[PDB]
Structures are given as structure tokens and as C-alpha cells.
UniProtKB/Swiss-Prot annotation:
Subcellular location, record wording: Nucleus; Cytoplasm; Melanosome; Cell membrane
Comment on protein domains: The TPR repeat-binding motif mediates interaction with TPR repeat-containing proteins like the co-chaperone STUB1.
Region feature Interaction with NR3C1, mapped onto this chain: 1-209
Gene this chain is encoded by: HSP90AA1
Identification of the protein by name: Heat shock protein HSP 90-alpha
Modification(s) after translation: ISGylated. S-nitrosylated; negatively regulates the ATPase activity and the activation of eNOS by HSP90AA1.
Residues recorded with modification N6-acetyllysine: 43, 69
Portion held of the full protein: 16 to 224 of 732
Quaternary data: Homodimer. Identified in NR3C1/GCR steroid receptor-chaperone complexes formed at least by NR3C1, HSP90AA1 and a variety of proteins containing TPR repeats such as FKBP4, FKBP5, PPID, PPP5C or STIP1. Forms a complex containing HSP90AA1, TSC1 and TSC2; TSC1 is required to recruit TCS2 to the complex. The closed form interacts (via the middle domain and TPR repeat-binding motif) with co-chaperone TSC1 (via C-terminus). Interacts with TOM34. Interacts with TERT; the interaction, together with PTGES3, is required for correct assembly and stabilization of the TERT holoenzyme complex.
Superkingdom per UniProt: Eukaryota
Annotated effect of mutating residue 32 to A: Strong ATP-binding. Strong interaction with HSF1, HIF1A, ERBB2, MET, KEAP1 and RHOBTB2. No effect on interaction with TSC1
High-level lineage: Eukaryota, Metazoa, Chordata, Craniata, Vertebrata
Family membership: Belongs to the heat shock protein 90 family.
Protein task: Molecular chaperone that promotes the maturation, structural maintenance and proper regulation of specific target proteins involved for instance in cell cycle control and signal transduction. Undergoes a functional cycle that is linked to its ATPase activity which is essential for its chaperone activity. This cycle probably induces conformational changes in the client proteins, thereby causing their activation. Interacts dynamically with various co-chaperones that modulate its substrate recognition, ATPase cycle and chaperone function.
Amino acid sequence: EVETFAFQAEIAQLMSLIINTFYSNKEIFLRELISNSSDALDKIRYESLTDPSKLDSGKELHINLIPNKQDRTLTIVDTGIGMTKADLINNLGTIAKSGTKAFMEALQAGADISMIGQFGVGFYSAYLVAEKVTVITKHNDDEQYAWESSAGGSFTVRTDTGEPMGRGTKVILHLKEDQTEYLEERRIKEIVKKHSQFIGYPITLFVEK
Ligand SMILES: Cc1noc(-c2ccccc2)c1CO
């Protein structure tokens, strides 16, 4: 059973701007998602300092980068706090609405897309390189859910029946046909070494066989 929701008008405009604006420095998407993963690991680690049982779903705190040339997907996995159903449908957008509005005003005030993280909506930079994004997420207080959007103004949410994650978030980028350089090992290493050198968790790049 799948539920289809419309994006809030502000987020829907930001997504259509990110897809249709010809911006060359597309590599910043990886920094934004790695930074989001780092935040999510901070929250579960902090919660566990007063409640060690919060880690029963998984003690490891890491970020995995998994390119797949055959599927043309780049997957960013983290074992962070994860996201609830309410997060995917309401709470993340409600927190963002002000940053999304402010980000559009800044884009006319001399700012470029690369400052998207300063407004808390960096996740949507995924659509610089991806035609479709799938998010698998698992929060200690909720079930495993699958979020998906190809932009176009709507997204879907469903209960995920696949491989249980335990805890964390998996972002699956279905890359555009002209953005396959981000499936290359030496390219990913360059972006990590240039944009995410100071992340307080291990970032493991999975090499394809
Ligand atoms: C802000 C914001 N608004 O929505 C999200 C989000 C992230 C993952 C899946 C679905 C929505 C964010 C995170 O930056």
C-alpha cells in the first residue's frame, strides 16, 4: 500500500529550481548528504549517552558510500537516528519551510546553489545529479519506511518490505544519464577529500568488483 503526497509549494519550487537551473558545480550534493548523515549519527550517539539501549538496534556509527554502475545508482548509508513516518511527511518540511523560503531570496541576493546547506535543505541538492531519489529509513520508535520522489511535485511513502536495516537512513540516488562520473572511485574520493575531510565518523567507500 502506497500513499502519494504533494510537496509543499515552497519545497516544490526549490526542487524544480534545482533540477532546471544549469549549475555546473554539482559535486556539492555529496557533501550535503554526508553532512546530513553526520548530523543523524550525532543525534543517536547523544541520545545513547543517557540511554545505551538506544543502540541495541546497532552499535556501529558509520557512513557507507556504495556506487553501482550497472544500476546507475549511488547509495549513501548511515547508521544514524533515522526518520519516523511523521518526519518524512510533516516534520522535516515544517522545520524547513523558513529555510526554503530564505534560500530562494538568497539566490537573488548574490548567493549560489552551493550554500544550500546553510538553510537546512541540503538534501534536495541530490536532484542536481539524480532524476529520482529513494530513501529507506528506520527509527527506533517506528517501522522501516521507503520514501521516493522524482520531483514533479509529489512523493510517495510506503512501508518497506525489503532487507531490514536495524537503524539509520539509506539514500539511493538514481543518477541522470550525464552524471555517471559520481559512480567512479577516484571521483568520489576527490569529493570526499575536498568537501568532507572533517567528519567525525568513518566514511567507507565500497569498491565495485
Ligand atoms: C529539510 C528537509 N526536508 O525534507 C527532507 C527530507 C529528507 C529525506 C527524505 C525526505 C525528506 C529534508 C532533509 O534535509
